[PDB]
Design an enzyme around this catalytic site. Structure first.
Site, PDB file in Angstrom:
ATOM      1  N   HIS A 175      -5.691  38.296 -66.826  1.00  0.00           N
ATOM      2  CA  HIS A 175      -5.615  36.812 -66.809  1.00  0.00           C
ATOM      3  C   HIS A 175      -4.443  36.335 -65.940  1.00  0.00           C
ATOM      4  O   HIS A 175      -3.303  36.782 -66.180  1.00  0.00           O
ATOM      5  CB  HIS A 175      -5.487  36.266 -68.238  1.00  0.00           C
ATOM      6  N   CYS A 197      -7.522  29.551 -64.494  1.00  0.00           N
ATOM      7  CA  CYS A 197      -7.403  31.003 -64.159  1.00  0.00           C
ATOM      8  C   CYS A 197      -8.466  31.335 -63.106  1.00  0.00           C
ATOM      9  O   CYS A 197      -9.615  31.496 -63.500  1.00  0.00           O
ATOM     10  CB  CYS A 197      -7.650  31.871 -65.386  1.00  0.00           C
ATOM     11  N   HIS A 246     -11.408  33.383 -63.820  1.00  0.00           N
ATOM     12  CA  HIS A 246     -12.239  32.922 -64.965  1.00  0.00           C
ATOM     13  C   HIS A 246     -12.537  31.415 -64.938  1.00  0.00           C
ATOM     14  O   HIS A 246     -13.311  30.972 -65.807  1.00  0.00           O
ATOM     15  CB  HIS A 246     -11.605  33.359 -66.293  1.00  0.00           C
ATOM     16  N   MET A 264     -12.642  28.838 -68.148  1.00  0.00           N
ATOM     17  CA  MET A 264     -11.245  29.116 -68.587  1.00  0.00           C
ATOM     18  C   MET A 264     -10.274  28.233 -67.797  1.00  0.00           C
ATOM     19  O   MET A 264      -9.446  28.781 -67.040  1.00  0.00           O
ATOM     20  CB  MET A 264     -10.848  30.584 -68.413  1.00  0.00           C
TER      21      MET A 264
HETATM   22 CU   LIG Z   1      -7.539  33.944 -67.439  1.00  0.00          CU
END
Ligand SMILES: [Cu+2]
Ligand SMILES: CCCCCCCCCCCCCCCCCC(=O)OC[C@H](CO[C@@H]1O[C@H](CO[C@H]2O[C@H](CO)[C@H](O)[C@H](O)[C@H]2O)[C@H](O)[C@H](O)[C@H]1O)OC(=O)CCCCCCCCCCCCCCCCC
Ligand code: CLA
Ligand code: CLA
Ligand code: CLA
Ligand code: CLA
Ligand code: CLA
Ligand code: CLA
Ligand code: CLA
Ligand SMILES: CCCCCCCCCCCCCCCCCC(=O)OC[C@H](CO[C@@H]1O[C@H](CO)[C@H](O)[C@H](O)[C@H]1O)OC(=O)CCCCCCCCCCCCCCCCC
Ligand SMILES: CCCCCCCCCCCCCCCCCC(=O)OC[C@H](CO[C@@H]1O[C@H](CO)[C@H](O)[C@H](O)[C@H]1O)OC(=O)CCCCCCCCCCCCCCCCC
Lengths: 73, 31, 154, 99, 93, 146, 42, 743
Positions: free
Chosen positions: D37, D84, D87, D92
């Protein structure tokens, strides 16, 4: 329970009885307001039977009995 | 008294045992 | 416009993409000597990128919601440069290739050892034959009309 | 305030994904689960403090291991959206202001 | 058979085909008669093929049926049931 | 291909994020990353060293379908001759060992037939296929429920 | 010389030289008219 | 009896006659081709010299000169490497600051936008970061300028020319004869003493005078251009006396036998250099010196021309006992008349050696600034593992070729070979059982762990906290090694590696070079997985070798030759009953084994060794010990290793690592493509090519060389080669992209 609020309750397919299950699995699989581990139905039979007229459990019981009769014949 | 507690072992453990024993007996010897 | 797309020159997402692209390269140019080989190379590609976006804008391409130049192949005459004139060019070149190959195969089919001239090219015969592809369309049309393009007897 | 990147269910979101902290108040983006992440700011909008590297984490390099924390501090009046890059396509993405 | 170099003879095919028993004892019962007379008197009713098979199958079946229909909660968590309140789904529940 | 297309288009429409498909669907890295790798996090996190949740049964089946599929490769790549000779030396071994040559088979063990092996491999391949895709589809839609 | 001319026309060598020439031509063409998504002359 | 040089003059005249003629060696090929299958055969049997003829002399002459050609190719490759390091590299910048600049010795031309691959490797340079570890070699050799690299490149170029010329010479002008090759006593005497003994003595001589002082100067912090040139260290000796005082006595210690006076630069320290993260150079020099002495004595064992020595035949036929009859009698006659026996022995040994090299190089990093260059370490280990595996499979291939073609009990009878052929069934049955047992009790543990974890029962799992399977033997051994220096190797100060233990972490530039590697339950499980895979591939290959001539299935398998499709669908089906087909599988299982090995290595290293050190001595690893708890179930491998590590390569697009993403996808493609050849048969394809040929014939465009579908064996060969290419290339891309991005 599902006919009362079709959008905010998950339909149940059948119960789970698996002696290999652990306690956290038992707690994880008890969904849909059931009293034990169950499976969530994705066949769409709830919506189908709700659309055509079935409302109570007695309707489904009569249906199952009639179909056992039909397959015996 | 809980009906699964009886039918899931019998159908998952007993029934295949009986059926497979019988079917082996039937398939694996001459008439 | 066609399919709800808009002229890239007047689109906003197409410009935003151009500025963003140009932005990152400029960052790569920094942290080095201002007039160094790597810096000079980065500059070159920056100018190249600006030229590509202006060329796209000039040619009148169609841009969607992502700002990417979509290609129309329905046959609209405002867009033949996208598929149809390149398609005619391709068909010409591919007919050239295929006709030259077929001409060669027919010419070498009469020797006793024709496979010898297939694993080892007769380059003099090939160079005599290559330039008939230039007129391959007329030759093929007249061969079809003659009835000698397709083998009878099969 | 501590923001956990990734959910225990493996869901690709922030915890809490949307919130509001006070001025000069440091926000810690911690990794909970599902790591590589990487927290990267929108760079778009966000009135004032228009530096990219000041709050952004550079693409390619991201948080490593199960639990990682990339400490940012904001301290800019206005609302910012932290997402992110790998993602942000699974939703996300998050918004964090300081009024 | 086994006359110096020969190993083949029509009269004794079994010796020729190696139909030997390399480990059988050919010895008398090592168990004392008294002990033998105790076992084969008590273990006799279990030596009938169909009888033993049917009894085994049905006895073991009802064994399992009883032992699982009447198992206590501390043996199988599946019958102890859940002990916690349930969570809600992403939107449903 | 058909069902991948349908599922991705709908899973991006149900999130109000149709531009995500509209833009990343035109190159195959987009299909791999933005569809397969992205929508597979909850499924593979069905159970982990920190516990399990209701998706575990799918996380298991997902791996199940990978196993089955893979063993389908065996019957498709390795051919009969190899296995037949292996089986014959196994037969020698069984006949030659004490306390167990007292037990005798009643059909001589043979390797599967050629057509039978092609059939078995195809069955394994397709079962693995169906099971892993069903696991992924139901877990990725059921996880987000949207 | 004659045999060298023959060997240089065997199929693999003929085709590698042909494709190297074709590659050079295409490379130079796209070096002069780069980033071409259409035919903009006529 | 005596040994001499024995030659033949101008056996074959150099000429262009046979270049014009395709497949001159094969009588059938020479005439010409009727179908497309002829073209494939031309290539498949180009280097099978022992079937183009039957004369051993001709086979061996061809082999000799082909070796010369291969050496020339290798030299050209080396010279290319050195020239690229000289001209298109940032080697000097890297030499100034090793642990910030990324090594890269290849740039690309800006043609179609591919110049994005010219990434920022630092040092005012833009190129493709290389993983060959060449910079570390050049630094350890003392190379400080690019003039030295240019001179090296040109020297290797002229060496490649010399090798090519010698290849032409020893085949067309002066070709040795059979009695010259069949002399193995003198050949061994020269390769042990001359090639390895003198070679390593010469290298120790280099390190003593060039690498030791120059690396001393570099580690003292001197600017690389302010360092004296190496020849100065030979001309002026007090330059060396300053760094190494005992260079003052100057070789009188070597003859007074006061060898202790050399203790300065001939050490036995062990461990790593805390400054460079590599082995002590004063240790490597001593090592090569001792190696040289050992090989120089060892190359004096076999008798050639002066009575003293050992006859290999005598040594062989002296060894025999009551279990093996007349064992080893007749092997000398077997190992000197068949090239395939020698080839398979040497291939097995070289593969074993390559894999040992990979392990020892990961464990005891020999080059400066190599340990903390994680990309180089990972790539070197993986590459050598793959090379070793391929060589080991080739060993089996050629053992089978020997058994089929050159084994003959009528004229060349050996006892041991015969006995093994006589109880091959017992051998294969027990190996079969071992494979089954090992597969149940290693992978079965993983399946049990997966279901125990999915059923919410982690206590029942085979893990470090529920049911421990501790590798007590490996732990005991490595604790014995940790305690070794001072107790049972008194002359050593540090243990030979840092993976043994003792604490003593070593870091370089804020990155961890090495630390003790802990062995837990996951290590037990994965080591038994390794044992399982190795045993299964051994089973396949050994079964192919032992049953290459005959079986209970088909009683005359040797008459069908070493390589063939089948003998019809009779006796139930005899698909792939040949020895060559067994090699085809072994490659599949070798792939599996090596893949699991490199995955294990990569995960364990990124989880328990590599990482970044900090000011307190807090080591944050790449993954916080996620290998000890997540590697025990297959879901952990799929999630924590592949899915997690795979994200780096997927996000590579739009950066300079984009080529790795492209190769990832392309390798996936070619792997999947192999399945078309591996799942189908040539009958369908011949029947389809039939109608395509019809379509061509309809338009007078059908070819004269009739297109045939590939042979059955060729289809399997295309299927296995594409499969291996795809799998190895996708692993290569993943590893490189991941370790270059996170490293
Ligand atoms: Cu992430
Ligand atoms: C701008 C507006 C005006 C434009 C005018 C354009 C005119 C056409 C273009 C160029 C004309 C000059 C061509 C170069 C000069 C010599 C060409 C020539 O006579 O060179 C000789 C050949 C001969 O052509 C034909 O060649 C055929 C086949 O002969 C040989 O063909 C091969 C030739 O090597 C092989 O030898 C082969 O074995 C053998 O069959 C025919 O049978 C005849 O012999 C002959 O007419 O012409 C060739 O094509 C040579 C190869 C180039 C041909 C180019 C044609 C046009 C494109
Ligand atoms: C094809 C229809 C079908 C299917 C797929 C299932 C599936 C299941 N039933 Mg079920 N059942 C059915 C019909 C079906 N049932 C019918 C018509 C009845 C009578 C109304 C029952 C009454 C019943 C009870 C009382 C219980 C189950 C239970 C179960 C679950 C445990 C498995 C088991 O014990 O087997 C089923 C056990 C039985 C006694 C079923 C017998 C009745 C059917 C008709 C037998 C058919 C056998 C037939 C000769 C073979 C058909 C061929 C084909 C199916 C292969 C399982 C998910 C157990 C459970 O709840 O799990 C938590 C449980 O206790 N079932
Ligand atoms: C994932 C796919 C897969 C799997 C599972 C296997 C499995 C196996 N291979 Mg194979 N192979 C494969 C792919 C696969 N292969 C492919 C693609 C190829 C082509 C190159 C080959 C080529 C190949 C060759 C050439 C050989 C094998 C051999 C073997 C066996 C090795 C012995 C062993 O491990 O015993 C143990 C068994 C296992 C480890 C399988 C898993 C066991 C499970 C986890 C246990 C579960 C039991 C469960 C309770 C069953 C009850 C369920 C109930 C409902 C009935 C083994 C069964 C070798 C052999 O025959 O061994 C002698 C052999 O020579 N393979
Ligand atoms: C295994 C050895 C090897 C490899 C893989 C490469 C690979 C590469 N080299 Mg290199 N090179 C090598 C050895 C090698 N070289 C050696 C031994 C020398 C002399 C000591 C050089 C001298 C050299 C120079 C001077 C340059 C390269 C360049 C290049 C890059 C461009 C490829 C190219 O040739 O352009 C295109 C290919 C062609 C134009 C066709 C090549 C035909 C020429 C005439 C030689 C081949 C003819 C053959 C003998 C028949 C490329 C990645 C260029 C570069 O790095 O760009 C920055 C560059 O300028 N090389
Ligand atoms: C001290 C003597 C000596 C040395 C140094 C070598 C060295 C070598 N031999 Mg050799 N050999 C020798 C004696 C020697 N041999 C004797 C006495 C015999 C039996 C009569 C053989 C028979 C033999 C065979 C059959 C083969 C070799 C091969 C090789 C090469 C192995 C591959 C390798 O390791 O690459 C290492 C690379 C290098 C060390 C680069 C340096 C190369 C140097 C310049 C070699 C020069 C040594 C040579 C013997 C000089 C004498 C020739 C002279 C008249 C010019 C290697 C270069 C293999 C080969 O031919 O490869 C082509 C092989 O097939 N040797
Ligand atoms: C094949 C390897 C090799 C070679 C070619 C040389 C060559 C040389 N060494 Mg040397 N040496 C070597 C190995 C080698 N050494 C090893 C392995 C050691 C460690 C035991 C030494 C230890 C050594 C010392 C102590 C000295 C030399 C010295 C010399 C030089 C003196 C010239 C002479 O009279 O002879 C010479 C160029 C002398 C020197 O440095 O010359 C200035 C000198 O004092 N060497
Ligand atoms: C010192 C090493 C060595 C040597 C000298 C030999 C020598 C020989 N081998 Mg052999 N082998 C080796 C190692 C070696 N092998 C290893 C490590 C393996 C395991 C893979 C094998 C497995 C093997 C088999 C299965 C066979 C041989 C055979 C042979 C004989 C004929 C080879 C031939 O001409 O085919 C022609 C060579 C080719 C067609 C080259 C094929 C191209 C490869 C497959 C592609 C490689 C891709 C490349 C690396 C990257 C992609 C490039 C692309 C993208 C552009 C020959 C005497 C054959 C034989 O019949 O023996 C009598 C035989 O069938 N070998
Ligand atoms: C079996 C475990 C073991 C191992 C692997 C080693 C290994 C080693 N020992 Mg050691 N040693 C051991 C047990 C062991 N030792 C024990 C139990 C004792 C008594 C406590 C010693 C006492 C001892 C001393 C006093 C010394 C070593 C030394 C050495 C190193 C030089 C080896 C050597 O002398 O060449 C081999 C010598 C030969 C004569 C060849 C014979 C081959 C053998 C006997 C078989 C070497 C790495 C030397 C050292 O300090 O290293 C620098 C040294 O001084 N050892
Ligand atoms: C522009 C795109 C369209 C082009 C249409 C070109 C004309 C196509 C119709 C005529 C085809 C033709 O004449 O040959 C037709 C070819 C055979 O060609 C025939 O061959 C005969 C024997 O040699 C005679 O020479 C005829 O003159 C000739 O037409 O076969 C067909 O295409 C079937 C259609 C009916 C004829
Ligand atoms: C490279 C050029 C090769 C030239 C060539 O082979 O032809 C020249 C000749 C082939 O040419 C032949 O020569 C013979 C005498 O040598 C006879 O005179 C033949 O008549 C003549 O055709 O081959 C060579 O001499 C080259 C040898 C190898 C050179 C490398």
């Amino acid at each position: 329970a599902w006919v009362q609020d079709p959008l905010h309750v998950r339909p149940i397919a059948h119960a789970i009885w698996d002696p290999h299950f652990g306690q956290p699995a038992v707690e994880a699989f008890t969904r849909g307001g059931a009293l034990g581990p169950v499976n969530i139905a994705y066949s769409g039979v709830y919506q189908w039977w709700y659309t055509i007229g079935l409302r109570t459990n007695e309707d489904l019981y009569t249906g199952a009995i009639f179909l056992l009769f039909l397959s015996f014949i | 008294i809980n009906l699964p507690s009886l039918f899931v072992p019998l159908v998952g453990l007993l029934f295949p045992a009986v059926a497979m024993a019988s079917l082996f007996l039937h398939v694996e010897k001459r008439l | 416009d066609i399919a709800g797309l808009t002229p890239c020159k007047d689109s906003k997402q197409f410009a935003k993409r151009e500025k963003q692209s140009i932005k990152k390269l400029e960052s790569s140019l920094k942290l080095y000597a201002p007039d160094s080989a790597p810096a000079l190379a980065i500059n070159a590609t920056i100018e190249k990128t600006k030229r590509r976006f202006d060329n796209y804008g000039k040619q009148g391409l169609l841009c969607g919601a992502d700002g990417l130049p979509h290609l129309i192949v329905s046959g609209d005459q405002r867009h033949w440069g996208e598929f149809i004139t390149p398609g005619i060019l391709f068909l010409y070149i591919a007919g050239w290739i295929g006709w030259v190959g077929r001409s060669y195969l027919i010419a070498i089919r009469d020797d006793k050892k024709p496979t010898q001239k297939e694993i080892i090219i007769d380059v003099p015969l090939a160079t005599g034959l290559v330039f008939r592809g230039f007129s391959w369309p007329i030759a093929a049309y007249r061969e079809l009309l003659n009835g000698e393009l397709v083998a009878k007897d099969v | 305030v501590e923001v956990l990147l990734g959910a225990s269910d493996g869901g690709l979101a922030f915890v809490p994904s949307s919130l509001e902290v006070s001025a000069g108040e440091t926000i810690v983006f911690k990794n909970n689960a599902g790591f590589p992440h990487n927290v990267v700011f929108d760079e778009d909008e966000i009135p004032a403090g228009v530096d990219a590297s000041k709050i952004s984490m550079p693409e390619e390099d991201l948080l490593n291991a199960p639990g990682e924390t990339y400490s940012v501090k904001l301290d800019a009046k206005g609302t910012y959206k932290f997402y992110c890059s790998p993602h942000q396509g699974a939703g996300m993405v998050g918004q964090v202001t300081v009024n | 058979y086994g006359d110096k170099s020969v190993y083949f003879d029509l009269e004794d095919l079994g010796n020729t085909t190696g139909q030997w028993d390399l480990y059988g004892s050919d010895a008398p019962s090592p168990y004392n008669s008294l002990q033998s007379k105790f076992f084969e008197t008590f273990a006799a009713p279990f030596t009938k093929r169909g009888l033993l098979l049917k009894f085994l199958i049905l006895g073991g079946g009802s064994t399992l049926a009883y032992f699982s229909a009447t198992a206590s909660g501390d043996i199988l968590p599946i019958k102890k049931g859940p002990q916690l309140p349930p969570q809600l789904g992403p939107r449903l529940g | 291909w058909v069902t991948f297309y349908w599922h991705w288009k709908h899973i991006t429409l149900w999130q109000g994020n149709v531009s995500q498909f509209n833009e990343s669907s035109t190159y195959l890295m987009g299909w791999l990353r933005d569809y397969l790798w992205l929508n597979s996090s909850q499924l593979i996190n069905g159970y982990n060293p920190f516990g399990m949740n209701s998706l575990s049964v799918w996380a298991w089946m997902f791996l199940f379908g990978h196993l089955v599929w893979a063993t389908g490769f065996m019957f498709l790549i390795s051919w009969r001759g190899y296995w037949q000779e292996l089986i014959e030396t196994l037969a020698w071994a069984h006949e030659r060992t004490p306390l167990a040559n007292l037990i005798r088979w009643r059909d001589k063990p043979v390797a599967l037939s050629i057509v039978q092996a092609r059939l078995v491999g195809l069955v394994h391949f397709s079962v693995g296929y169906i099971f892993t895709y069903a696991a992924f589809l139901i877990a990725s839609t059921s996880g987000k429920f949207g | 010389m004659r045999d060298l001319k023959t060997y240089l026309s065997v199929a693999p060598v003929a085709s590698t030289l042909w494709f190297a020439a074709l590659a050079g031509l295409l490379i130079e063409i796209n070096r002069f008219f780069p980033d071409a998504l259409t035919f903009p002359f006529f | 009896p005596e040994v001499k040089i024995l030659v033949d003059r101008d056996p074959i005249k150099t000429s262009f006659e046979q270049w014009a003629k395709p497949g001159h060696f094969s009588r059938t090929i020479a005439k010409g081709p009727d179908t497309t299958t002829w073209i494939w055969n031309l290539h498949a049997d180009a280097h099978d010299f022992d079937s183009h003829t039957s004369d051993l002399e001709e086979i061996s002459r061809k082999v000799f000169s082909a070796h010369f050609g291969q050496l020339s190719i290798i030299f050209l490759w080396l010279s290319g490497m050195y020239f690229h390091g000289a001209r298109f590299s940032n080697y000097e910048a890297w030499l100034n600051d090793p642990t910030h600049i990324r090594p890269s010795a290849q740039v690309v031309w800006p043609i179609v936008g591919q110049e994005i691959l010219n990434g920022d490797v630092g040092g005012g340079f833009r190129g493709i970061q290389i993983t060959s570890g060449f910079f570390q070699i050049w630094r350890a050799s003392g190379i400080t300028s690019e003039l030295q690299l240019y001179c090296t490149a040109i020297g290797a170029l002229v060496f490649a020319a010399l090798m090519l010329f010698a290849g032409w010479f020893h085949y067309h002008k002066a070709a040795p004869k059979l009695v010259w090759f069949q002399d193995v006593e003198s050949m061994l005497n020269h390769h042990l003493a001359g090639l390895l003994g003198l070679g390593s003595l010469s290298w120790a001589g280099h390190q003593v005078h060039v690498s030791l002082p120059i690396n001393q100067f570099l580690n003292a912090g001197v600017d690389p251009k302010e360092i004296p040139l190496p020849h100065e260290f030979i001309l002026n000796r007090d330059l060396l006396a300053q760094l190494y005082p005992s260079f003052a006595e100057g070789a009188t210690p070597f003859f007074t036998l006061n060898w202790s006076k050399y203790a300065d630069f001939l050490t036995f320290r062990g461990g790593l250099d805390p400054l460079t993260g590599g082995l002590w150079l004063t240790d490597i020099a001593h090592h090569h010196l001792a190696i040289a002495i050992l090989f120089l004595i060892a190359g004096h064992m076999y008798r050639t021309n002066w009575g003293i020595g050992h006859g290999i035949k005598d040594i062989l036929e002296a060894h025999k006992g009551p279990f093996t009859g007349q064992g080893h009698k007749g092997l000398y006659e077997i190992l000197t008349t068949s090239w395939h026996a020698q080839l398979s022995i040497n291939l097995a040994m070289l593969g074993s050696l390559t894999i040992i090299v990979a392990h020892h190089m990961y464990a005891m990093p020999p080059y400066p600034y190599l340990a903390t260059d994680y990309g180089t370490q990972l790539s070197l280990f993986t590459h050598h593992m793959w090379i070793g595996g391929f060589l080991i499979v080739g060993a089996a291939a050629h053992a089978a070729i020997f058994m089929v073609r050159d084994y003959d009990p009528t004229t060349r009878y050996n006892d041991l070979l015969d006995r093994v052929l006589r109880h091959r069934d017992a051998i294969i049955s027990h190996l079969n059982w071992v494979c089954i047992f090992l597969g149940f009790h290693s992978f079965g543990l993983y399946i049990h762990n997966d279901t125990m974890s999915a059923l919410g029962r982690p206590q029942d799992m085979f893990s470090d906290t529920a049911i421990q399977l501790q590798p007590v033997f490996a732990q005991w051994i490595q604790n014995t090694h940790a305690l070794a220096p001072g107790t049972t190797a008194p002359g050593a100060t540090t243990s030979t590696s840092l993976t043994w233990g003792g604490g003593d972490l070593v870091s370089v530039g804020g990155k961890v070079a090495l630390l003790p590697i802990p062995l837990g339950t996951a290590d037990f499980l994965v080591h038994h997985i390794h044992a399982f895979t190795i045993h299964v591939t051994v089973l396949i290959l050994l079964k192919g070798v032992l049953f290459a001539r005959s079986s209970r299935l088909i009683p005359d398998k040797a008459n069908l030759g070493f390589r063939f499709p089948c003998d019809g669908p009779g006796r139930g089906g005899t698909c792939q009953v040949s020895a060559w087909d067994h090699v085809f599988l072994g490659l599949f299982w070798m792939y599996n084994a090596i893949s699991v090995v490199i995955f294990h290595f990569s995960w364990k290293m990124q989880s328990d060794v590599w990482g970044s050190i900090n000011d307190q001595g807090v080591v944050t690893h790449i993954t916080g010990g996620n290998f000890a708890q997540s590697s025990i179930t297959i879901n952990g491998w799929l999630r924590d290793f592949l899915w997690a590590q795979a994200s780096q390569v997927i996000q590579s697009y739009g950066s300079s690592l984009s080529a790795y993403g492209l190769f990832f996808l392309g390798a996936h493609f070619v792997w999947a493509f192999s399945l078309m050849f591996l799942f189908s048969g040539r009958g369908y394809w011949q029947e389809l090519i039939e109608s395509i040929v019809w379509a061509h014939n309809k338009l007078k465009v059908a070819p004269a060389t009739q297109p045939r579908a590939l042979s059955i064996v060729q289809g399997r060969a295309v299927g296995v080669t594409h499969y291996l290419l795809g799998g190895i290339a996708t692993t290569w891309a993943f590893f490189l992209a991941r370790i270059i991005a996170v490293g």
